[PDB]
Amino acid sequence: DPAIYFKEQFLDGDAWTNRWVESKHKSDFGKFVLSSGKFYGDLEKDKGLQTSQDARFYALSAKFEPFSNKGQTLVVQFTVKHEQNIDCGGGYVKLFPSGLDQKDMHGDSEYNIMFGPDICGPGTKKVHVIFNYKGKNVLINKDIRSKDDEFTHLYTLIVRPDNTYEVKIDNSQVESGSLEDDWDFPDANIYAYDSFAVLGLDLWQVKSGTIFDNFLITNDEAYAEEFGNETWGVTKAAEKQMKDKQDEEQ
Ligand SMILES: OC[C@H]1O[C@H](O[C@@H]2[C@H](O)[C@@H](O[C@@H]3[C@@H](O[C@H]4[C@@H](O)[C@H](O)[C@@H](CO)O[C@@H]4O)O[C@H](CO)[C@@H](O)[C@@H]3O)O[C@H](CO)[C@H]2O)[C@H](O)[C@@H](O)[C@@H]1O
Ligand SMILES: [Ca+2]
């Protein structure tokens, strides 16, 4: 049986607010709203969290029963849709250990892993993969290109107990190697963390309108691939046809 540590598909309406916490660290964080956007694969299935305010910081997080990846695989996966045609704005997640105050979470709150696309003008169009190791946040030595169009894309990070990793975009490998070689941190336990307890969205955006959906944290690579195909894989073609429709009808 795959261990599902966390899963969020926003399938139950306004009830998501019972599972996600707004940080109060700042008084003027932008608001996340539940939305399937202007075009979608399915009105209900493609409901996710959308940034609703221009030129704001965002800080929202969801807790889950704490776990450790010691001795097993860790997979983190979600969809990002920059439906607005984004100029500058984050689309990554952070994983936090136990002890985070969700009501006070912010950009400098200490995290274990940060992963996902970041866009900031043409000069920043990169997928971050950051490991906190011995008091330092270490950025991956590799250039992974992020998606910049208006459509929904799947982002997957896989971390293995043999100190290997893989990054997938749209369920397809884009980068692969070992933690020893692709970060400037030999330690057999680089991969492992004593606890994960919270998934956070800590973002700055200029033009807002990005939608996040289909969050998954699991110990099973095969299950993540399947879940990805059943979520993003299903959204992909349907949403393209409805975008094609809207252009032709205009
Ligand atoms: O990028 C690695 C870094 O990520 C996390 O920290 C993020 C940064 O603190 C910051 O992200 C930057 C922000 O840049 C802009 C704005 O804040 C600047 O004042 C302005 C002037 O130069 O430029 C931008 O408008 O947002 C962009 C777009 O996402 C980012 O690319 C920049 O990196 O803010 C975000 C949100 O709070 C932080 O997540 C990690 O915490 C950190 O450890 C890591 O080194
Ligand atoms: Ca959804």
Radius of gyration: 17 Å
- What is the CATH-assigned architecture? Sandwich
Q: What sort of overall outline do the alpha carbons produce when their principal axes are compared?
A: globular
Bound molecules: a molecule of 4 linked components (MAN-MAN-MAN-GLC), calcium ion
- Report the end-to-end length measured between terminal Cα atoms: 48 Å
Largest sheet entry: 8 strands, antiparallel
Helicity level, as a percent range? 10-25%
Examine the coordinates and then state which fold CATH places here, giving the name of the CATH topology: Jelly Rolls
Query: How many DSSP E strands?
Result: 16
Q: How many distinct helices?
A: 2
Would you tell me the structural class of the helices and strands? mainly beta
Return the CATH class.
Mainly Beta
- What is the string of SSEs from the N terminus onward? EEEEEEEEEEEEEEHEEH
PDB class: chaperone
Keywords: jelly roll fold, chaperone, carbohydrate binding, calcium binding
Assembly: monomeric
Entry title: Structural basis of carbohydrate recognition by calreticulin
